[PDB]
RNA sequence: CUUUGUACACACC
RNA sequence: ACCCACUCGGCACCUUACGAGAAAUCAAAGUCUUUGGGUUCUGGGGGGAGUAUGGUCGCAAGGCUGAAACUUAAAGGAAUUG
RNA sequence: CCAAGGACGUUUUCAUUAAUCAAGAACGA
RNA sequence: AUUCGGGUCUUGUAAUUGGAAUGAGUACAAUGUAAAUACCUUAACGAGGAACAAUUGGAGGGCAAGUCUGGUGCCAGCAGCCGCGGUAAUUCCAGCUCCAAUAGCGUAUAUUAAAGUUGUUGCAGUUAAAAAGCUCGUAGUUGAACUUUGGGCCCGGUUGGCCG
C-alpha cells in the first residue's frame, strides 16, 4: 500500500500501418541518422506532438495572458536551450513549424558525427555504446542524449579508454601478448 | 423545427428519448440484458476448456466442396455440447478421444466464421499443448 | 490582404459585381463587363475612354440585369428618366 | 508548332499576357491547353485511379477505362480532369489535357496572427458532389493536411501545408469526393471577406486593349 | 445434412509433400545494421528501379 | 426500328 | 347575369431552377456542414416476427403493447444499356 | 323543419385567453 | 583531351584479406546491505562466424511485399470480407526471395475511436426502416409587442507615440 510509481508511454504508433509514402520517409530518416527501429521516430514525433499541442493550446488564448507568457517563454527557453530551435525563431509559432529532423540533428550520434570523431553515424553508435565518449567529464553510452547547446565544446573521447590514453586496449593487449610469446 | 424539442427546459424529454432509442441498437441491448452471461455457451468468457466427445466431418457451404474436420466437445463449467473446428492441416490426428481442449472464438463475435456452418469455436490447445507447436513439431503430445 | 509588414500577397484580387456587390469567381462564365464609351461635346465617342460596369452571372440569370443596368446608368448621369427609385 | 484559334490564344502566343492572373481577373474562358502550359510551365500531373467501365450490349460487354487526373503547381493553381477512353494511355493524355483546361486558383490564408507566408485556407469551405460533402477548415502551422490520401494529394498539389478535413456521404466513390474537394477549393475564392470590402477601379480587359494583335 | 464424411483423408497434402531441407545461408546483419542494409539497398543501390521502383522481381 | 414494363443479366431454356 | 381591373380565402394546373435531392422529382420534399423559429410521434442491415408469452379491450372474430433463442452478407431505392 | 360551419365585410367586443400534445375521450368504410 | 590509357575523390558488390573496439558471460577485490543477492566501479579471463547464429506474422485486394520453383488437383486445405483450390494455384503444402513490427509479435473476448450507424453539438421518415386514421384534450415543452433612451461636464487607469 505504498505510493505507486508513475509511468508513461513515450511513443505512439500511426493510425495507418501500411502506406508507401510514410514508410519511405521514415526509413529514409532512419538510414540517414542511423537508428535501429521506427520506435525512435515514433518517440520523437510523440514529443513533437506534445510540444505542438502545448503551443496550440497556448496560442488560442490572447497575448498578454500571464499563463501564455510564462509557459510560452519557458517553452521557447527550453527549446532554444536544447538547440532544436534557432535563437531568432522565438515567436511561439515557429515552434509549430518544427520538424522531427531538427530533433534528430541534436542526438549524440549525429553530434559525434558532426564533430568529426566517427566518419559515420554507425561508427558514432559503436563509439558511444562502447563508452569512448564523454560529454562533460562524464561517460555516456546512450545516443539519444539531446545535447544542450553548450556541452558540444566539451564532447571529447573518454579519459579511461583507448583513444584517450591510460591503457592500450583489450585485444591490443592480447595481440601484444601474442607477439611477446612469438618473441620468446 | 427538425423533430426533437429544442427548449432550454426540455432535457428530461431528450434523456428519455435517448434511452428508448438506445435500446434499438444491438450491442447496447446485448450488454444490458446480460445475454453473454445467460445464453452464451462460454458464459461471457474468452476461452473455455472441454472434453472432446466425438469427431465430425462437417461439409462446407456453397459454393465450396470440402469436409471441415470438426469435433464435438462438452464444456466443463456448463456442460453443454459445442462444435469446434480443428484449425490446421492434419491436426485431427492430435485431438482423438476424451482430450482436454481449450477453445476460443473465431473473431466473428459469436457468428459462424466462413463456409463452415453452425460452428463458432476453434481448438487452441489439446492436453495442455498448443496445436500450433504440435503442428510445427515444436512440442510433442503427452501421455493421456 | 496582407501579412505583418508589407509584401502584398493574395494574388488575383477579384472583381466585384456592380449590382449586388458580390465577388465574381474565376469560372463565372455568365458574368459580363459592359463597356460604355463617353462623348465629349461633338456627338462622337473617344477610343479608349470608357466607363465600365461588371455584372455577375446570378443577377443576369434572374433577368434583373436590365433593371440594375438602368439604375447604375441613371446613377452615373448618362440616363435621364428610365429607372425610378419608387416602384 | 501551335497556331492557335482564339484571340486569347493568339495574344498569349504573342507574349502580351505574361501571367495567368489576368485570365481569372477578367474571367476569360480558357479554351486551349497551350495557354496553360505556356503560362504555367511548373505544373505536374498524377493519375489517381483507372477504373474499367462496362457498357453491356447484345454481343459481349464493351470495355473502356475512366481515368482521373489532378494537375497543378504547388503554389496556387489546381486542375482536375476526368476522361473515359478506349485505350488507357489516351485516357491519361486526355485527362491531363482536360485537367489543364480546368485550372483554378486558391485563396491561401492564415490560421492566425498573419506572421509569414500563407500556409492554410482563409475560411471554412465545403463542396458537394453526388452524396459526398467535403468540408475544409483552417489549421495551425505544422498540423499537416489531415485527409484521405487522394484529397491529401490534391491539396498538397494545391499549395496548402495544413488543413482540417471532414467528410459526409459515400466517400469511397473517388470521382465524387475528388469533385467535391475541387468545388470546396474553388469556393475559397467565392467567399467575401472584410479584407476584400474595399472597392476597385474595375480594370479594362486585355481582350479589348490589345485588340489589333487579335484574330483580325 | 452432410455431417459425416471421410475422415481418413485428413493430412493428405501435408504428408504427400516432399521434404526439402532449408539451405545454409550466411547470417544477415541485425538491428541497426539491418536498417543500414535496407537503406543502402533501397536508395543508393537503386539497381532495381525497372518501371516504378520494383524491388522483388521474378526471374525474367 | 421507336415507345412501353420487368423482381430478367450464366439474360424468358 | 356578364366584362375589365384589383384583393382576400380555397381545390388545383402549367413553365423554370437561384435552391434541394441518390435520382425520379419538389414553390415545397426550398431558406439544412454558411448545420438551432416552436412542438408531437416513429426508425437504426435482412429473416425469425407483428410470432411466442405477459397484460389490456372485446360476446366472439380479433384490436393495442410486444421480445428472445437462432440464422444470414447482403435484402432494398432511383436511374442507364440490352 | 332544427341547429351548426368556413370565407368575406367591419373605424363592433374581449384581452393573450395561445401552438403541439403522454394519460384520457369522441368519431371512424 | 595523346587511339577505349592512368585514373586521383567517389558509392555499393565479393566461396578476399587485415589490424583494432567492446559488452553479454565468469571473477580477486571494493562498494551495496541488518546480513546478503543484484546495480554502479573494477584486477584477470572473455568475437570471426559452423560463432556469442532473432523471432512473430505475411506476400490477389483491403493492406508494404512473387505470374519464381516442386507437390495436391473443388481433395487436402486457405480465407475476419470478397474469394482461391475441378492437372499450367501470384491465395493451399514446402524451398528460394521479399516484406512489416522487432525483444517482441500473433490469436480470442470485452470496450473506445472510426460511428453524423444514438445524432445537444449532429441523423432520418414521398418512393430505401420509419408521420400515430382524424379530432378534442390533462400533464410536459414553447409562447406577440410595450415601460431610461439620448445629450452634456469632469476625474483617473491600460495599450500605445514622437522624446529614447
Is B21's CB less than 7 Å from nucleic acid strand G? yes
User: How far separated are the first and last CA of chain D, in Å rounded?
Assistant: 20
Cell numbers at B19, concatenated: 434511452
Alpha carbon distance E42, E56 (integer Å): 11
Measured distance CA(D179)–CA(D48) in Å, rounded:
13
Q: How far apart are CA C39 and CA D7, in angstroms?
A: 28
Residue D59 DSSP label: S
Rounded Cα–Cα distance for residues D46 and D152 (Å): 12
Which grid coordinates are listed for B62? 456453397
User: How many structural domains comprise chain E?
Assistant: 1
Is A25 an 8 Å CB contact of chain D?
no
Give the 3-state secondary structure of residue B56: strand
Q: Which residue has the cell 495551425?
A: D140
Which residue has 458574368 as its cell numbers? Answer: C31
**Between the CA of A35 and the C1' of I46, what is the distance in angstroms?**
29
Give me the CATH code for the C1-87 domain, please: 3.30.1230.20
> Look-up: residue for cell 498573419?
D114
Q: Does E49 touch chain A (CB under 8 A)?
A: no
Task: Return the closest nucleotide (C1') to the Cα of E41.
Answer: I12
Min Cα distance A49 → chain D (Å) is 9
Neighbours of chain D (3+ CB pairs under 8 A): A, C
SS3 D210: coil
* Burial status of residue A100 (CB atoms within 10 A of its CB: 0-12, 13-18, 19 or more): buried
Distances (CA, A) of D96 to A181, B58, D40, D178, D180: 79, 56, 14, 15, 19
Distance, Å, A173 CA → I153 C1': 100
Cα dihedral C68, C71, C76, C79 sign? positive
* Interchain contact D/E (3 or more Cβ pairs less than 8 Å): no
Chain E residues near residue B92 by CB distance under 8 angstroms? 7, 10-11
- Strand I-proximal residues of B, range 53-72, CB below 7 A, are 60, 63-67, 69
- H helices of D15-131, where? 21-25, 33-39, 88-101
D169: left (phi over 0), alpha (psi -120 to 50) or beta: left
Residue of C85, C35, C32, C36 whose CA lies nearest to C61: C32
- Cα-flanking dihedrals φ and ψ of residue A54, to 5°? -65, -45
| A19 contacts chain D (CB < 8 A) | yes
Output the DSSP codes for chain A. Answer: -PPPPP--------S-S--HHHHHHHHHHHHHHT-SSSHHHHHHHHHHHHHHHHHHHHHHSPTT-HHHHHHHHHHHHHHHHHTSS-SS--SSSSSTT--HHHHHTTSHHHHHHHTTSSSSHHHHHHHHTTT--BSSSSB---S-----SSGGGS-B--TTSTTSSS---HHHHHHHHHHHHHH-
Q: Which chain E residues are within 8 Å of A125, Cβ to Cβ?
A: 32
Angle formed by the axes of helices E32-39 and A121-128, to 10°? 180
Q: How far apart, in whole angstroms, are the C-alpha atoms of residue D91 and residue D49?
A: 11
Nearest to B110 by CA among B26, B8, B3, B4: B26
Q: CA(B37)–C1'(I109) in Å?
A: 13
How far apart are the C-alpha atoms of D99 and D33, rounded to whole Å? 9
Query: Which among C8, A51, A99 is positioned nearest to D114, based on CA atoms?
Result: C8
A88 grid coordinates: 531568432
Q: Which chain E positions have a beta carbon within 8 Å of B59's beta carbon?
A: 1-3, 5
Query: Is D170:D143 a contact under the CB 8 Å cutoff?
Result: no
* Closest chain D residue by Cα to residue C47: D209
Q: Rg of chain B's alpha carbons, rounded to an integer? A: 22
Q: Does D114 touch chain A (CB under 8 A)?
A: no
* Residue D47, C-beta contacts closer than 8 angstroms, at least 6 positions apart: D67, D68, D69, D92, D95
Peptide bond just before B63 cis, omega within 30 deg: yes
Over its C-alpha atoms, chain A yields an Rg (Å, rounded) of: 22
Radius of gyration of chain C (CA): 17
Residue ranges making up the domain that contains E27: 1-60
Contacts of C75 (CB under 8 A, 6+ apart): none
Nearest to A98 by CA among D110, D140, D149: D140
Reported resolution, Å: 3.0
How many Å apart are CA D134 and CA D120, to the nearest integer? 16
Q: Which residue in D157, D113, D168 sits closest to D138, CA to CA?
A: D113
CB B49 within 8 A of CB B100: yes
Q: State the method.
A: cryo-EM
E33 touches chain A (CB under 8 A): yes
Sequence-distant (6+) residues with CB within 8 A of B54 are B71, B72
In which element (H, E) is residue D206 found?
A: helix D206-209
**Which pairs from B136-141 meet CB under 8 Å and 24+ separation?**
B141/B94
Contact D152, D178 (CB under 8 A): no
- Using the beta-carbon criterion (under 8 Å), do D189 and C23 form an inter-chain contact? yes
Amino acid at each position: 500500500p505504498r505510493a505507486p510509481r508513475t509511468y508513461s508511454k513515450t511513443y505512439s504508433t500511426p493510425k495507418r500501418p501500411y502506406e508507401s509514402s510514410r514508410l519511405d520517409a521514415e526509413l529514409k530518416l532512419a538510414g540517414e541518422f542511423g537508428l535501429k527501429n521506427k520506435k525512435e521516430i515514433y518517440r520523437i514525433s510523440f514529443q513533437l506532438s506534445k510540444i505542438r499541442r502545448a503551443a496550440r493550446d497556448l496560442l488560442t488564448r490572447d497575448e498578454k495572458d500571464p499563463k501564455r507568457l510564462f509557459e510560452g517563454n519557458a517553452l521557447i527557453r527550453r527549446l532554444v536551450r536544447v538547440g532544436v530551435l534557432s535563437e531568432d525563431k522565438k515567436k511561439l509559432d515557429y515552434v509549430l513549424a518544427l520538424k522531427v529532423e531538427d530533433f534528430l540533428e541534436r542526438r549524440l550520434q549525429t553530434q559525434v558525427y558532426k564533430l568529426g570523431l566517427a566518419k559515420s553515424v554507425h561508427h558514432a553508435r559503436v563509439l558511444i555504446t562502447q563508452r569512448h565518449i564523454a560529454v562533460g567529464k562524464q561517460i555516456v553510452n546512450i545516443p539519444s542524449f539531446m545535447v544542450r547547446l553548450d556541452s558540444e565544446k566539451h564532447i571529447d573521447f573518454a579519459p579511461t579508454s583507448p583513444f584517450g590514453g591510460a591503457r592500450p586496449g583489450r585485444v591490443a593487449r592480447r595481440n601484444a601478448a601474442r607477439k611477446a610469446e612469438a618473441s620468446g | 423545427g427538425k423533430g426533437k424539442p429544442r427548449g432550454l427546459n426540455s432535457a428530461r424529454k431528450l434523456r428519455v428519448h435517448r434511452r428508448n432509442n438506445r435500446w434499438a441498437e444491438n450491442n447496447y441491448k446485448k450488454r444490458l440484458l446480460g445475454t453473454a452471461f445467460k445464453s452464451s455457451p462460454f458464459g461471457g468468457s474468452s476461452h473455455a476448456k472441454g472434453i472432446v466427445l466425438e469427431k465430425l466431418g462437417i461439409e462446407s457451404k456453397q459454393p465450396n466442396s470440402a469436409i471441415r474436420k470438426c469435433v464435438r466437445v462438452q464444456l466443463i463449467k456448463n456442460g453443454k455440447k459445442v462444435t469446434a473446428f480443428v484449425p490446421n492441416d492434419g491436426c485431427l490426428n492430435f485431438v482423438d478421444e476424451n482430450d482436454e481442449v481449450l477453445l476460443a472464438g473465431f473473431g466473428r463475435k459469436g457468428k459462424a466464421k466462413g463456409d463452415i456452418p453452425g460452428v463458432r469455436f476453434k481448438v487452441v490447445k489439446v492436453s495442455g499443448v498448443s496445436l500450433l507447436a504440435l503442428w510445427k513439431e515444436k512440442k510433442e503430445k503427452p501421455r493421456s | 490582404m496582407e501579412n505583418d509588414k508589407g509584401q502584398l500577397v493574395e494574388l488575383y484580387v477579384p472583381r466585384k459585381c456592380s449590382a449586388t456587390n458580390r465577388i465574381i469567381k474565376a469560372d463565372d462564365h455568365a458574368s459580363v463587363q459592359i463597356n460604355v464609351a463617353k462623348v465629349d461635346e461633338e456627338g462622337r465617342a473617344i477610343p479608349g475612354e470608357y466607363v465600365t460596369y461588371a455584372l455577375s452571372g446570378y443577377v443576369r440569370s434572374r433577368g434583373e440585369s436590365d433593371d440594375s443596368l438602368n439604375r447604375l446608368a441613371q446613377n452615373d448621369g448618362l440616363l435621364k428618366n428610365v429607372w425610378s427609385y419608387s416602384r | 508548332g501551335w497556331v492557335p484559334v482564339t484571340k486569347l490564344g493568339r495574344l498569349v502566343k504573342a507574349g502580351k499576357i505574361t501571367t495567368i492572373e489576368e485570365i481569372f481577373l477578367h474571367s476569360l474562358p480558357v479554351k486551349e491547353f497551350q495557354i496553360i502550359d505556356t503560362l504555367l510551365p511548373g505544373l505536374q500531373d498524377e493519375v489517381m485511379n483507372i477504373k474499367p467501365v462496362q457498357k453491356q450490349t447484345r454481343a459481349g460487354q464493351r470495355t473502356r477505362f475512366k481515368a482521373v487526373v489532378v494537375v497543378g503547381d504547388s503554389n496556387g493553381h489546381v486542375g482536375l480532369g476526368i476522361k473515359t477512353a478506349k485505350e488507357v494511355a489516351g485516357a491519361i493524355r486526355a485527362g491531363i489535357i482536360i485537367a489543364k483546361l480546368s485550372v483554378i486558383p486558391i485563396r491561401r490564408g492564415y490560421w492566425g496572427t498573419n506572421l509569414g507566408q500563407p500556409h492554410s485556407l482563409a475560411t471554412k469551405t465545403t463542396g458537394k458532389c453526388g452524396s459526398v460533402t467535403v468540408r475544409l477548415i483552417p489549421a495551425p502551422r505544422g498540423s499537416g493536411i489531415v485527409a484521405s490520401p487522394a484529397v491529401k494529394k490534391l491539396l498538397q498539389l494545391a499549395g496548402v501545408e495544413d488543413v482540417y478535413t471532414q467528410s459526409n456521404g459515400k466517400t469511397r466513390t473517388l470521382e465524387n469526393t475528388l469533385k467535391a474537394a475541387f468545388v470546396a477549393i474553388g469556393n475559397t475564392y467565392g467567399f467575401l471577406t472584410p479584407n476584400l470590402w474595399a472597392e476597385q477601379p474595375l480594370p479594362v480587359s486585355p481582350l479589348d486593349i490589345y485588340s489589333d494583335e487579335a484574330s483580325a | 445434412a452432410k455431417v459425416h464424411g471421410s475422415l481418413a483423408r485428413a493430412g493428405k497434402v501435408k504428408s504427400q509433400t516432399p521434404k526439402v531441407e532449408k539451405t545454409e545461408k550466411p547470417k544477415k546483419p541485425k538491428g541497426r545494421a539491418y536498417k543500414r542494409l535496407l537503406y543502402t539497398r533501397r536508395f543508393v543501390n537503386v539497381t532495381l528501379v525497372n518501371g516504378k521502383r520494383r524491388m522483388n522481381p521474378g526471374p525474367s
